[PDB]
Write a protein that binds this DNA or RNA. Sequence first.
DNA 1: CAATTGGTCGTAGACAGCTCTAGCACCGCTTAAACGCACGTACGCGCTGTCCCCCGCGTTTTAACCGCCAAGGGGATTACTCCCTAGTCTCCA
DNA 2: TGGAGACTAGGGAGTAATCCCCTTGGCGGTTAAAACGCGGGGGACAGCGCGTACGTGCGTTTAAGCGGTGCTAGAGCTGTCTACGACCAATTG
Lengths: 76, 76, 88, 88, 74, 74, 90, 90
Amino acid sequence: NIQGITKPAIRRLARRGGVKRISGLIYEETRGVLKVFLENVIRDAVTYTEHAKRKTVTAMDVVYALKRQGRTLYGF
Amino acid sequence: NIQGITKPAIRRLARRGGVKRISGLIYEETRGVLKVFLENVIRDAVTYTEHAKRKTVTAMDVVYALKRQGRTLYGF
Amino acid sequence: SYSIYVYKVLKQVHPDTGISSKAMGIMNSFVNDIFERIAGEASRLAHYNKRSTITSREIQTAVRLLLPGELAKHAVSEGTKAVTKYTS
Amino acid sequence: SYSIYVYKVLKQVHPDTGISSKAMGIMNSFVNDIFERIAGEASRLAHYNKRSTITSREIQTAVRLLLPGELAKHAVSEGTKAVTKYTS
Amino acid sequence: LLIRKLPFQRLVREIAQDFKTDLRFQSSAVMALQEACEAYLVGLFEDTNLCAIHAKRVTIMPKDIQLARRIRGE
Amino acid sequence: LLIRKLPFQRLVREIAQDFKTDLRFQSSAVMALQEACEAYLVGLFEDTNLCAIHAKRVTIMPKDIQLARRIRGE
Amino acid sequence: SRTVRAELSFSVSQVERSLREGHYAQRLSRTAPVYLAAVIEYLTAKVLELAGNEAQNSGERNITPLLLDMVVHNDRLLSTLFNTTTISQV
Amino acid sequence: SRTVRAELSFSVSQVERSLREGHYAQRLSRTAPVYLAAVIEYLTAKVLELAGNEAQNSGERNITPLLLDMVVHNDRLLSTLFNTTTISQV
DNA sequence: CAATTGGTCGTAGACAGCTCTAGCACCGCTTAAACGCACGTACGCGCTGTCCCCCGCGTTTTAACCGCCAAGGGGATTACTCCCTAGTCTCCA
DNA sequence: TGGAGACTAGGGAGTAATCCCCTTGGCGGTTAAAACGCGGGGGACAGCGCGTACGTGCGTTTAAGCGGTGCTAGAGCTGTCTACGACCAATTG
């Protein structure tokens, strides 16, 4: 489920983002933003895997899916 | 000069943007945003003209410069 | 270039409604743009797999990549039900 | 692919400072990315002018387009003062 | 990383199931997705904190994420 | 259009002078730049008005343009 | 002719000729330009279907660029394709 | 050898061989890969010059990916090139 | 076992020559649009106060992580070997 | 007056057949991390007030726009014509 993105993991992401205090409704909105981001990147990674006639989503399919959003990822 | 971008032309752009009331300091900031936007697009249009060994900046050099910013322009 | 076929599809979709002369240049720049975008995406997909031939499968993948959602599902369905009608 | 030359330039710029093994893969993906970006920009510039040969002038223009500002001025100056030292 | 790895792998393997059933993921594809998702969320909360300071507040609210995503174009 | 054409042509011909001296512009290049600049400024004031409503205000201020450009990545 | 034979409206041979003059690859496929002409035909017959629906919904006779700008930025069906486009209107 | 002859550190022949296997055009130029190898050489000798300056400024011995992530997002000289990049750090 | 250097061989791009759009320039007259007031009032901005509701500290509960060892699906490869795409003669508007 | 139908001669991909990584699946014992609950108090959020500062309406000033001449630069050709990059035979590490 999306519930695995727990309350203190979003709190740690906001503490690294520089947020001092978090409202009690950020937690379900951040999961809804993360789910949209994954539904936009995994769709392209699955498209590259189905185009490569594979069944295993490699890390270069994820790098290409992030490259198609202007989010180039170095190290794979 | 940048002063040709007058006070009521910025006011008409803000009225089309949906702004109801405008502070008295928007006028010099909007000219400083427009000058940065033109310094970013005209640099690429002049680069395409110097690459095409021309001296006349055509409208397709402007379309290519806007395409290099994710601002595709149809009709030229 | 592609302006002679935009009016030919418009005669099928709306045989009564006409089109202007600036709107024909807009639809012609739209067609030459979605053409040079789909073909560019299919050339990058032919390079990522180290192929040399752009088949219809790299076009179907570049349509899945470029067009979002229902537009990609209908463009793939129209390309598939045009290639199958072509081979028969 | 390009990892053998990253360490060779690093021996010139910092002969005392070493590099890790993940940072070599990061610099190798950086080099293969700015290569496949400059060459892609120079192929679009060779298509916009209907040429067929990528010369050094389409590389100088793709460097002016891709790199912003002072990085473009220094990359053009280094490419020019490497082609002139090459022809001599 | 800041998100736990096994619930993030369950999340990717329950999101990707809607696209193609019975897929396998490399062990580094999930870490590339988790690295990219935290590098997305921190960059999102850096503009949410700007939208919360802009209203003369400290607590971020869901309207700050909604403004930081509508201005960004999401 | 909303900006007057002759001061916008003077603005383009005084910005482009820093890049290459003694350039000429087509009559449709300046209209493409003016169409793109008003289509930029209206889309900028649509997010500035969102940043001004977000602070419970009506008047837009320069900090609203600065927030709408920092979130956008400018 | 393969366009009438495939019962399409765009010419396959001109899209193939533009793929050759674009040099997007070294060699095309047998049915790749038929698929590409059917997708571009679908997108044109989806945009102009809405421009012709809006010209008669508003009451206009021809299709102006104001109709294109109002449709493609409305109609969330294809408003996503034109998030970053600007119809010039001049 | 043209790399030592041009007094460069990257191999011109491998960048040219990667332009041939990328099929970016039909025919290259005589001096286009020398220019491209000198620009990529400049960018590598500008990023690793700063990674080697920061490893000795901090006091580190090797170069870790944390040094690359701290430099390329600092250093407004080349922070514009990496506005939309993410070093993975894993 | 690289990458290079002499020859050679088309052919693409350099390049004088020339037609003619079209961009730049100036003059004069409108008339809209900008510009400068002065006034009244919205509405930013500071303040004070009641009151959620978030943070911090304890327990206690969960499940992530680690270290094993299977087991089979499936990259990645090497080998042929057909079946395709690239070169060429006519119809039917 | 433009396709595109039968035939060639090859040469990327299809398609088996083969290792052998490596992904998925258990178990079991950790101990970190999440979950709950209590309480105190920072701080959204509402309400009020003073008072800048923006908008609207006026008269006056500017200039943009328009129409009409010129006039030369310089895009687009068209036709040569070299120098160029694509191919092939002996090497300092």
